[PDB]
Ligand binder design. Sequence first.
Ligand SMILES: Cc1cc2nc3c(=O)[nH]c(=O)nc-3n(C[C@H](O)[C@H](O)[C@H](O)COP(=O)(O)OP(=O)(O)OC[C@H]3O[C@@H](n4cnc5c(N)ncnc54)[C@H](O)[C@@H]3O)c2cc1C
Ligand code: SF4
Ligand code: SF4
Ligand code: SF4
Ligand code: SF4
Lengths: 490, 490, 490, 490
Amino acid sequence: MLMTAEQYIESLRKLNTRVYMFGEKIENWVDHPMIRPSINCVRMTYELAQDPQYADLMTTKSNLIGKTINRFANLHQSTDDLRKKVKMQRLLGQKTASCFQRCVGMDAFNAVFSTTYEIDQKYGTNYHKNFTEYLKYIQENDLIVDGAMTDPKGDRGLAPSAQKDPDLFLRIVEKREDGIVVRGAKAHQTGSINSHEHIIMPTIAMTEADKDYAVSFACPSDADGLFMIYGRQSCDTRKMEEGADIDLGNKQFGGQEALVVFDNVFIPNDRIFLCQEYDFAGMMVERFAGYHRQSYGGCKVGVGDVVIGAAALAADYNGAQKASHVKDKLIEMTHLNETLYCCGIACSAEGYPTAAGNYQIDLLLANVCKQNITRFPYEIVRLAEDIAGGLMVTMPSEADFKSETVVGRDGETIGDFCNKFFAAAPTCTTEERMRVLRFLENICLGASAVGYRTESMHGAGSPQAQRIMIARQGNINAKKELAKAIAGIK
Amino acid sequence: MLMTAEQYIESLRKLNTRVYMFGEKIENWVDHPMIRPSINCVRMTYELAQDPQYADLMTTKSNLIGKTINRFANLHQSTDDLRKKVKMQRLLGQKTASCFQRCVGMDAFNAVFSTTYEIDQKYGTNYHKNFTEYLKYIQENDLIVDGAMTDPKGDRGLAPSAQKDPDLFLRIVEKREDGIVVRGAKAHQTGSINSHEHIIMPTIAMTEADKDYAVSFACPSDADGLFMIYGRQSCDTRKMEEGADIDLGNKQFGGQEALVVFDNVFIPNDRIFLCQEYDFAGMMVERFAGYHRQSYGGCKVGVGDVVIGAAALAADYNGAQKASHVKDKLIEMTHLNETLYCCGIACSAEGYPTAAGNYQIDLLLANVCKQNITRFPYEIVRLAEDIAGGLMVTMPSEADFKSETVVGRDGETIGDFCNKFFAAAPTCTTEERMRVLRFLENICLGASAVGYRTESMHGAGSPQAQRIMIARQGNINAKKELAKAIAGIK
Amino acid sequence: MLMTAEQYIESLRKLNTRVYMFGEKIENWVDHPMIRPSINCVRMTYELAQDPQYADLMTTKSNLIGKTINRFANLHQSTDDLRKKVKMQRLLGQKTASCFQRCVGMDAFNAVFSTTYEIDQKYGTNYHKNFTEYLKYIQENDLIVDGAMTDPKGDRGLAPSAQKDPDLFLRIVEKREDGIVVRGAKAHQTGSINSHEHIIMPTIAMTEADKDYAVSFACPSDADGLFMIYGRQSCDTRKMEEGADIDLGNKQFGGQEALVVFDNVFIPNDRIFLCQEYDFAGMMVERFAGYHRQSYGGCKVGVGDVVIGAAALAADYNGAQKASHVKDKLIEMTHLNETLYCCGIACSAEGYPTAAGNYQIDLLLANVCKQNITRFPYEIVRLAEDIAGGLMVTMPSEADFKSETVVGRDGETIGDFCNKFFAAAPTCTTEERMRVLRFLENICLGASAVGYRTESMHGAGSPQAQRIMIARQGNINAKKELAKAIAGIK
Amino acid sequence: MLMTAEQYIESLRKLNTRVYMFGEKIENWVDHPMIRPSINCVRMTYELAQDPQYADLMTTKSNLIGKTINRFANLHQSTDDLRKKVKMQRLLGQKTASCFQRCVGMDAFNAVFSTTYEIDQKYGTNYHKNFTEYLKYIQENDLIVDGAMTDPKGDRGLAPSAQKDPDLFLRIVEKREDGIVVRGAKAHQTGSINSHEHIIMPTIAMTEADKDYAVSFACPSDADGLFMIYGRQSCDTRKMEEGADIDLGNKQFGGQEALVVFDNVFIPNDRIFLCQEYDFAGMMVERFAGYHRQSYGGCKVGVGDVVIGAAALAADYNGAQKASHVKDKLIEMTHLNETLYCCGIACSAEGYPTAAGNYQIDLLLANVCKQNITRFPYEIVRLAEDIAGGLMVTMPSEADFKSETVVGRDGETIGDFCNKFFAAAPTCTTEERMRVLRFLENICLGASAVGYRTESMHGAGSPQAQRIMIARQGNINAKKELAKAIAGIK
Ligand SMILES: Cc1cc2nc3c(=O)[nH]c(=O)nc-3n(C[C@H](O)[C@H](O)[C@H](O)COP(=O)(O)OP(=O)(O)OC[C@H]3O[C@@H](n4cnc5c(N)ncnc54)[C@H](O)[C@@H]3O)c2cc1C
Ligand code: SF4
Ligand code: SF4
Ligand code: SF4
Ligand code: SF4
């Protein structure tokens, strides 16, 4: 089955998830103003799959369980599937202008499926079967599964087994006959609080001495010992203001991060996908990161469509839409944004099947996609700020625009003065103009700048991470031989 | 006479300023958590003038009244005075990492001083004497004067006298035998609320049809009919949280903006510096902006020095300080920051005396300075984000770090888990690392990002405003003749 | 039938082409040292189609004539065909590091094919039959057809029918019962001198007043009244030096341009593909330029691979290859070059069939590919110059390196001193080092810089030409509505 | 005294300098086409000094000999002198658009003056007196002295004393009672062939193992054992064409490089400035390189003025001068060019006296100047190429434009067709349009590209050379302390 958005929300209310914020446990986190935006954002992935206008792109027949499923849970069977994933992601970014979270499950399912096949090939284990039966259950129930890779990591100069505190990468602390017990944490986890399950993977290649840190598994979000500590966001507490609407920029949607703590969690044998086979952890890292780097050529481009649209609208509202330099800046934003799309589509079109059978992207081209993602969203935002003008960051509050407090000589109110002085071109009301300038404030400096700017920098790895792999994947010694041939060198 | 910081703060509590925020009048605005950072920042200009270590830079002898005055009130008497102004601003940027506001007073005094001399030379008026006597009063009492130029402007495609609402540029609405009555507003005014006086200037050159808009004057900040509406800032309400400290990034200092409404304010004749001589409005704009564009070559460079420092410290605390790519990014930051300083210093060294006798910067080089200001701070922040890592935007609240709520199997509290998991290199405590990461959050995305990024874009004119003047000041026709000579064209 | 490389060259010797250089007719132009590199370069497209290792990419079965043909003459039947074209072009750029010219043929055939189909549907003409019979002749005989679009153009501020001299765009000057007479010229034509035929196309959209300029046709390269004047290239006369080899950088290959003059040339009815249907001139322009813009994503990327290899080898020869900064600059060159490739592959994968049934690229994504081509080759060259060092532009002549003239106190020769003083790592002989530095001189400043740098800037249109179309194709008003929905605006 | 340009040229004819090119000795090198543009270029430093309109900037009173001298031989006595140096170099760049060479003498005199003072203080040697007596000779005779620092260097990863060939850095090979004997070579030496004297300096800091390489001296350009080998330039042999003029771009001026060989040259005691005091080699390097880095802030900006003038004039001639994107690119070129000027002026204004008494630039700001010099000239050329159009690199030869060869049906000549087809706006003749397009070809890809692009990259060190010192000069640890203070860190 496929759940409606409404059924998705009701299922969360039945979970026993432990959520903490500002030193207190949140009992009704589903309705909490600082969390519900991220829930509305992933709820869109259920909603569009219910719409016939998008059902073909949003859903597909599973080859695993022979029924229709959301495309966010499918195993790629061709390069056409790789391209549709990117187009689906561009659609959701246009619809939400934020992080809609579900891509990490999709990308972890494909990386774990393929990696578990080759682990078993070598060691005679049964991880691939563990994973395959687990994905059947997710596909049967339309559940959200949080992919979690990045540990807190401690001292960046040392290996996992060289740290002063051995808990700073997640690790196995006991092997039982029926399961394992793990201890540690995963940081920066967008959407973890509103997931049904979590799938964990190691963050880096592992040597033999690091073998207890070579662990992968899946578990319910309310598993014994598991809890979450919310992470703050720029402008987060504006959502706690009574009547908050215009000053939010994006009232309906958002994405939020949490620290996920595993305080000695027991994993049964059939949920384990990796257990001390240190030589396959870097494979898991490479393939998950690769799919996530591909993903940004869809989601960031969709969000960039909305930023471009809001800057263009602001120029109309201000009255400056005919100026040549404003038109030229909008072309530049379009050009950079579509270059990102080109990298996402190209790494899809040049993909190939893994030994397990499912399709994977061209890893060099996905690395080039991500490297551009660390640069162009920042410039798209800078050009948006130019076009908008200074009022996007100096505007009085919404409470002031609606205030009936009298302040003028002839009985004029604060609200009267605000609506009068911030009027502009005849094509908008003052409130319409303020709404689009707050949308820009929110994604240029506010809660959504966290995703569009800083997650673009570090998501699926900081820039140096891709540069190291681009050098290895660049074939430079083969290129030196091309130069010898042209220059006349034997 | 020079005031101490304590005396400045006491002088504000005697003022009757009308300050409104979220629909309510703020009675004790001097102690309001969202406004006091602003006050502490300007108060540093008083504090350092009391320190013999900085006494030389911070003070000088008045050429109008002979006494020692703060350099922020001095008429420049050489290009050595112009370079010292820039160096003074770099120092205050290093000490506050924010906008310390007082520069607009300095820059308005020097522009209105030289322009009023020329108005009088032509029309037989007395505005130069009016201004000179006014500046003696300021020099005697060490007061803060808010320079206010930018109107709301309404429809950007129309002239001031063609707007549908004639009040969207500030204008003369009555002329009496003893003074004038003005109506309108000035937007984006940083430090307006904690000034003793305001000095108003027009925002663009004016035609004869716009002559009611060619007005300049000074007035006390509590003159009758004058009031302010606070503008919001990214993360502003973090300041209202109980025990707010680490999560603010910059707890002591900040710079906040407001809408200044002139609800039929009367100005006596001795306080008028321009009154319908429309042909000199453009001169006032050119010179005030020219000095403000010079000013950024000192203040943004000193703020930049702290950002560079914080990024370098974060690398040490993370443990990644020996990596070649981190070292190269710190060098790039340093290079871009010093390029700004070179523009600031050069436009100063190439300055010259006005007819009135005070010194002015090279207008072309100051425009080049500000054009680079619209670009390099944004790249300095992007590089800082890279070096810091993801925790800068996903960190739990300081209340979580301090929380004794028990959540671990063996009695561990929320505070213990945060302090354990976010530990890094042995060079810091966890709290120290969280403090530098929050400083970076605040200036890359939060309340200080408003000044370091978006005011760098629009302060003293959006980028296209300098480009238009660089073309005019470029001597392109003379350069075409250089080319003809070399290419052998007659 | 496919021709061998040697048969291509002998076929050129039978033509009566009229070629002029430095004021004289060149009778044996096939062996002239300043023209033979162009011929050697095109000749590789025949040579590689004879090698079974490349034969699959270089050749394909024609649906039109029912035999295997060179892929450079094929009408695209699928997006797979569009991706193979780009991959073939990367292969040839790796093998020659230059402009191998034959792409303009391929690209003109697909554009004229799809355009003439639609002219005929609207007007009842039979240009589509004229064109398919002509393409049959070209496919049976394996000939080179130079696509010629860009006129000299005259005063850039005026339309073709408004020029002072009506000949500055090519036009019909007479209509006869058996054909037409055309007069004018096409400038900048790479490979025109070593083509068997020419296919002419208008350079811009045309109005009714310009209808005599709306003309397209094919003619033999030795048609009566047709002649060529060679254009100069940087370092071109180094090819005239006795024993020239090392100082050429690329001895075997190059690409040279000429002015093609139509001195009242008669075209028979069967060779005419457009004749005064002004409303289809812009269709031909958009489709030919769109394919050529796609082409750069393959050819400049293959050339870029050789430049990267040459810089990397120079670092090995100099002995600086282990330096972190050198490594990082080679990664930047690789990243930028592969970004170009992604744009070439993506506009191919997102392609579609025309009404005529052959496939065409996504025009927006091709425009994005070309816009990046105007930027990234220039930066790849700059980083290559950094890595190579100063000797690439101050090296003594190869005549000095082999000179036996005695200049040392103990009998040492000029050649002795040059081989001694410019030695470096044991990895190379001095001569080997000089060979790779001369390759870089030739592509960074010399003969190959004309194509890798300046043709990247202007080929298939100057950058503003793509910016105009990106605005139209950018769907900006639809993006404004996305922003409204997020911001809460009706 | 001061020589006239004609007297300078005549003095060269009396030198017995040994010059070789293409395997042959050149006896009359003063009139050789490939060398005379270099001589004309330095000759302008004499011509301008004879001009009353320029004499005050071009000449100054020597405090060493009490007479009027060319400013290119002066020891700086103030920061005003440092600024005037920069302005004189901008003037000469405007007048020649090339490398006028004499700066290296000026910059070597000031660095050797100050360094020898400190050597003598530590070792009791007489090098300072040797130098001051030498500069008196140069000032009384108005001579050109070539500063020569860069050796060929061999394996870049090894120190001079670790090279396999010990002559790849210049060294002392014999010490006599009356002087020393030196052996080795200096590469890349611009204007070496037409200097009267040479002044040699080491190229890198030296350890005790390298003490035989710590050598500095001066010698006549025709000293026994000294000779030069010409280095090639892009497009060099166009100067050998009969009647060469338009196709040269810059017919009168240029700057060429040579390998200077020291084949066991004797240097008398009174001409030695450093002889194995290894601990002072690094000081001489830092000071000479810092002055030359400052110099680019003037010379490349003067050349950049001419490139901006030539692109603007090309737009007028083409007829595209009203286009907004053309205007914006000319503004961009102007902006980047003046940014370089700001760095040149700033490092001058922030100068200071050495222990010896003459003034030196701020070394950090000169390093910032030169780092921007490695970037901005490349972008200024790319934009000029855009504005010019493709004809700058595809134009027929001047011999074709003048050819009377008949090729038209009606008797038209090759020259007739060229002058006809390459006409454009009414503001120019075709010949005037071709002259400016050829100037741009010559500095974007030809002979002047060597200087404006590649010497901007490597002269006074490759980019990495400045980045290493910016890290050392950046006070990063002091900046960390500023961040601690603001973030609340003890
Ligand atoms: C046209 C021109 C004119 C010149 N005129 C003069 C002149 O008149 N007088 C003068 O004395 N000099 C002159 N120079 C020479 C100039 O100073 C140099 O080119 C440069 O300082 C010396 O470097 P190089 O040419 O040996 O290059 P290399 O040192 O070989 O540099 C190539 C690259 O390798 C890197 N590299 C090299 N060594 C190391 C290392 N140890 N560690 C890490 N990376 C390394 C460099 O940073 C660079 O990226 C001129 C240069 C040019 C191009
Ligand atoms: S950042 Fe993008 S790809 Fe990653 S989970 Fe969010 S929406 Fe998806
Ligand atoms: S932005 Fe800078 S120059 Fe302007 S008032 Fe603030 S601290 Fe001063
Ligand atoms: S520039 Fe490239 S696409 Fe065009 S004809 Fe040359 S090799 Fe082919
Ligand atoms: S490159 Fe410039 S500073 Fe150096 S010698 Fe030439 S003209 Fe002077």
